[model samples]
Target chain A: FDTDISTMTRFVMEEGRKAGGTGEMTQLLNSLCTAVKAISTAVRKAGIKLDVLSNDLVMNMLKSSFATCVLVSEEDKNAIIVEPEKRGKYVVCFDPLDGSSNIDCLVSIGTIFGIYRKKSTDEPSTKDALQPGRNLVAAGYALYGSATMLVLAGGSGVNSFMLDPAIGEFILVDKNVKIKKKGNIYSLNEGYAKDFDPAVTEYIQKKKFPPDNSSPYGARYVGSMVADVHRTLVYGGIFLYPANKKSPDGKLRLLYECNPMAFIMEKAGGMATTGKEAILDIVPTDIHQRAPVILGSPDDVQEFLEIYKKHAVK
Target chain B: FDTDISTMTRFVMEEGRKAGGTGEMTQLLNSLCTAVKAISTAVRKAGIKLDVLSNDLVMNMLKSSFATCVLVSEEDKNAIIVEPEKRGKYVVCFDPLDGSSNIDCLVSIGTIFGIYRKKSTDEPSTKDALQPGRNLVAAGYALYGSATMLVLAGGSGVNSFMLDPAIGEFILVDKNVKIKKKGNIYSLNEGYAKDFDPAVTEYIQKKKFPPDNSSPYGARYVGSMVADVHRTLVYGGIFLYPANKKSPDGKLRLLYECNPMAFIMEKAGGMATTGKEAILDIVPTDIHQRAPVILGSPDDVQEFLEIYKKHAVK
Candidate 1:
């Protein structure tokens, strides 16, 4: 039997193929892959018997690729890699570094991308590289911190699979990860009492909330975006990071974080918005715009937006 | 030539002597050694592969000692042995199944333990074991999911060391795992808007709120509590899970989940609480009593509790 170069070659070709494509998403994919490759190489070079890599090094790698787009949002590292530049009737939206801050220490982190096609009357060849986000074709994310995985959601629903490091290909682990209909888990922060509007402030009191009044709901919060979002998919829950007095412009970036995540949430039957407006509808004048985000079970997100509608303005 | 069994016995006894005890701690330590010996003997009878007894499995075996408590949180199949019936003032808390959940998936997980003294003054024979959590003479967690290492927080500070399977002993690795103190991230759920009161809602919204109106705070939410909390400890952030109306009683079991973690967080100078009450202060009515939990960055948790103060009655 011939000695095998399959695993080694696959790693190179897939990453190479991923790098060859244009747009922010391709860059993000390449960067994430490159990071994985770097760590694998580093582990081998260091003769350490570890298998996983950190998210920080991966984020740095994506930054190294430096594809296109101007302005950067810290939270949107996961979404920027694929923001469509406009291939005539096509567009791209992505999360280049979904949870970059989580890289250094031990944890699970990932990347997400949403591909869109622009509805245009012009010839396909004449399309611009930077197109509007409305033209999304497909979206996906790479969970690199744990067992390497890639999750994708399109018109046909969402599908999740793991990467077989041995073969260097995505092996389908989940055909479709249906977004739970009624979530009993809620994730949020309760640290800013002085900065919140009365309506918002009243919402977090443990006594009068959720399951007691209606359905028993549990609260969970773990500061990593993708990790929280993925948890929602695994076990039903809603995630919220809304706008308050401190972040008038909102803190979560739009181009790379909010927009793409918004698109994915929409496809998954979950909802996404800026607490006051629909995240997907907001047009970007700058690539690194931040948006207050609220996503999860549709009812929860909608109810949240309604609360914002009541108290968001002066 | 006759070899002296006294010399070999002295080597074994010497290791035991270093503990400087003839009581429960010593007894338990000896029990752990015996259990491993039992398993090893059993393995020999079945002719199992030695690789199956890797560092991770050894970690699981060590955690099995937790079942001695009144309540225990189990690993995949093993129960933490808790000796509640034994007449002693000290309780050995453990994650007998630490990272047991990650074994099949090959993820990093471990068994963590905290030794606590019973509140009962009547139990004087073991009064010496009734020392404060801060005086933990010995505390360690086996990270069997990976390198089969043991990390100890010996009241002095934190140190990560590894177990050599061949020698069956712990060797020092990184003496200091300085877990940073401040964090900008807030991890939680956003789906249970219906379940949350104004306090949590406002707290979360502050992260993405407009800077003009609210205090700026970073937002992050990873689903896995251990992974997320571990990350936050390293990178800086807070993790929260309150008992909302949905699971009005709360989801996480207090004794097994909260206390062990409380021990580690407090050791690292971090704080752990049940939103309003300290985790240690709350008397255990049941081994698995559900309670609201707030932990991580001290300032962040205190600020959140301030918000909780207003919502205390609402």
Candidate 2:
């Protein structure tokens, strides 16, 4: 495990570089490797288990080990300790290990973070209380795999760094990533189409039965958020997870995940919205707040928005 | 690239079990490496388009170079390539690149393959249609990142092998992967739920808004099928793409992509389905048939099924 950890650490570090220089998306990637290192140390001696995938454990390690402004989660009371005057300026929220349920099974999981600009420090100083989606500085996540990686969307653009275990640093691998449109695949929950409105249904049916040969485009859905969004960012497709009755406010938490990603999307010139509204426009009332989020290649997202407006009763 | 490929090949040949290992999966894997070597030779300099995140060249290379039994597409002609010789009792269908659109964007993309035992190779060469879900033989996908990997599922179990670019072989990293039910978080397409039916919507909403406090389960959605599905297979999590108005038959193609993946899902004891329908039950009329696919951890899939059934409209 340590071998894997160290190997991952080095992959990202070695890849960090200037945006246009040979290296790209390096700084955040370096931070990602640092976070993994912190966790590896805690789980080093004993083999890691479900407990090690906790928010407290992951956030504690990251906050203490890095230069983060404030760390927040849905599971614990906010224990953020940013510089006093700097409060109400910027806040970072995250799911330290997304898809953690897969960990005990030895499946891939990821770290998700949303950085938001703080609204006020007037309230209590707990991390859980802050829900600052309107204000964010930077955000990113790391997917631990054969070659560990740090992928994030900050104020700049979407960037990725690979960890090289040998040197224990994130080397800039891919920089200034953008969403593409052509030959791209889209991911939508197809099972519920039966219950969808006619326009939405017509739109999907047409996609499956496009006038142009169907071989031109493909569709796929991976069950993980970080993985799916990462793939979309990589391949240029729209990912839809609108607000349904089951998750009316939208399923994903706003403060920790979506907002930070939206910031990244905007920087990358992509789009992020809640079907009808922009994710960045939403005000977070709680740190672990949830909201509807639609993002990806601008064309796909915009296309869906047009369809939604045409069909939406409002 | 060839130098690294050779190195990886040497490593695999050096450490791998002999060709006729006890497991057919191992033998198949070995053969796969051999095939990869052959295909890589053809694709290595085919202008891989490292700049185009969609990597259509790389995808076309994989699609055209392989000895695929048949080629199916929802957009193209239904049945393609009659296997005059019947390579085996099975047929393989897949997305040479799961997230092609992301290729040019500098994000991760992957290859997905699903194998289904042919219903009858003897029923005239034109009768190579696939049977329902039970006939699936194998399923897998490859994610080409800083480090490449192939995750496969056979009758025995799910296994993950990392490509040793230095040795040009997939080294077994994990075998018989498992997914825990209550491990960590919930992942899905949170942005597309607005078009979902009440049942799915209700279930997700309940989970998101637990009466006690907040839904303990976290949400995530990354757009890449291979990347996200790969993570879910390794980690525990239910990936949902319930048939909604947007994709009636489902967005993912059955013959090539979903079916092969279904085999992988079952091998690992995970669940793959079309909400009320079994993924294996659907017959492949064309090579690139599309279907609504919902898969992942056993508990999650089963839970969603119940929700779907109860919410079914008369």
Candidate 3:
């Protein structure tokens, strides 16, 4: 399996762009990517027998690989806090296995992550792990679907890479990615259209009327945020998970989901917002804080916010 | 590259059970599979610049390798009929590339194919290619998404395989696959809901009410038949592209799209039909025959047919 090992090494060398200077962050991300790569292999190999255990396996890999770093993940009841003496200079938050339910179906599921430079202080709190979006020095996602792909952005620019399984490397495919300024596709879970804020409903409804001398828009919702938002980032369209009465604070988490994606979107010349404010501007009071998300092309996001401003009762 | 080549040889040797005695059919299928494997590689390697040329590249590879077989594809305006003396024993029909539009966004796209034994005749007519689905000796689809997957069915049963990019071989993952008897997901292009038959509309509407001790079934439409049906094949749900006033004959093709999927679905203990008839039962009148398709878990498909019978207007 030297071939497989080379593929993994190549993946880290190329996808680990941020690892260029320090080498520390690249090793951490490489470990997580390696863990997911194994998880992906098992999911396909084991089929139905693999499920929630997949999440645990991922978290375990994270813990063992980054024993010296602050690790925050969705699987843990509370963020794992390493002793200050053992802690390293960075905090890493991740969704080890996003859209785990989709795995059984062979649909595209992903691993999303954000890495931040720890504040230069001695505090041993998860709050030290809760850096704002701008504080993210590196962010990326690995999608395991028809083909494995790793897309990453180091504060410089967003780059997308495809895994060459033969070589075990993430080869750069698209560089300095820029989302289309406007696109006709719109993605969301319209099944819960009834539960959405009236403003969210109005924006989607209006797009269907083919205004602005355009043909009626197309709709696509994979139900997985990483899959959906990844498509938007590539195709230049809007993705929405608006605040509704059922879970008014919104569904996606702020620090891990929104922030990392927000950083990537910003780097890609797209916009990410909470309908009321920029996602990057959010101040975290809780590690697991959830918020509404509407992100995509700058123009479409601007239009969506206009509709939100007009119809939101708040 | 030898490592990759060996992987292909291994795939056909193991998965190509239809080639137990005569190696001719296995060679053909292996060639097509290799083309897609190459196409899948180029897609991840070359982003937007890869489009129609990719399909052409695939078709060219098939032609050079299978010099004596009749190849029918969407890319070619007319089926490339081999001379009577040189014509091989089989006819191959395929969509060189499905969901080409979704490729730019890194969404799952696929290559679909059906292989049939040619009738013993001297004349080389496309009609020799229009065999019913039952005539299919083998069928499969290769999905190019987060992870590349190739699922195939010979007369015996359906099996799923994943590409070990490290070694460049399709490895057996799920053998004698069985889809869920019932699932809580429904996939369709809801944007066209207005143009659909009232029968299609009613069925989707009723499912929203959360019946049979189930939460509201989720809606997922990836706009790619292979991706959608692959999900249904693994998850046990319904996928619909029904007859409508706009395209009463249906959107998916009978020979290439419907037949291949129907063959696999049946082998997997599932069902595939055109609302009124079994897909494999259809007699093709043309090489590019189109039909309405609704396929999934046997029970789910049966329930959908009941809805179609109750509401479909002649």
What digit string (tens of lDDT, one per residue) describes model 3 on residues A1-314?
33333343454456556456455555666667667667666654452234456556656665555433577787666777665555556788878778776765556778888888777576556877777787888888887755667788876688777666554566566777888899878888777765777787778877766557455567788777778888898887888887765678888998888888999999999998897888888988877998888899998999898888887667
lDDT of 3 by residue, B167-199 (tens): 566777777788889877888877665577877
Alpha carbon deviation, residue A216, candidate 1 (Å) = 5.4
- Candidate 1, A1-314: lDDT as tens digits: 32543232243344445546345444544555556544433421231112223445644554554443321224332233322442122233444454444444444455555444444444332133233444455556665433555566655567665555434445456655667776766766655445556555545543135534664455555445666676666555577676666676767766556666676677787877766567877776665567777788786666566656666575
**TM-score to native of every candidate shown:** 0.59, 0.53, 0.84
Worst-scoring 10-residue span by lDDT in model 3 chain A = A1-10
Runs off by more than 4 Å, candidate 3: A1-68, A82-86, A145-147, A164-169, A211-213, A243-248, B1-23, B47-68, B83-86, B165-169, B210-214, B243-248, B309-311
TM-score winner = 3
Task: Find the candidate with the highest DockQ and give its number.
Answer: 3
Q: How accurate is candidate 2 locally (lDDT)?
A: 0.57
> Clashes in candidate 2: how many?
114
Model 1 reaches what TM-score against the true structure? 0.59
Model 2 docking category: incorrect
Q: What TM-scores does chain A show, candidate by candidate in order?
A: 0.67, 0.76, 0.88
Error of 2 at A55 (Å): 3.1
Best by lDDT: 3
Instruction: Give candidate 3's error at residue B148 in angstroms.
Output: 3.2
* Positional deviation of residue A57's Cα in model 3 after best superposition, in angstroms: 8.5
lDDT of 1: 0.52
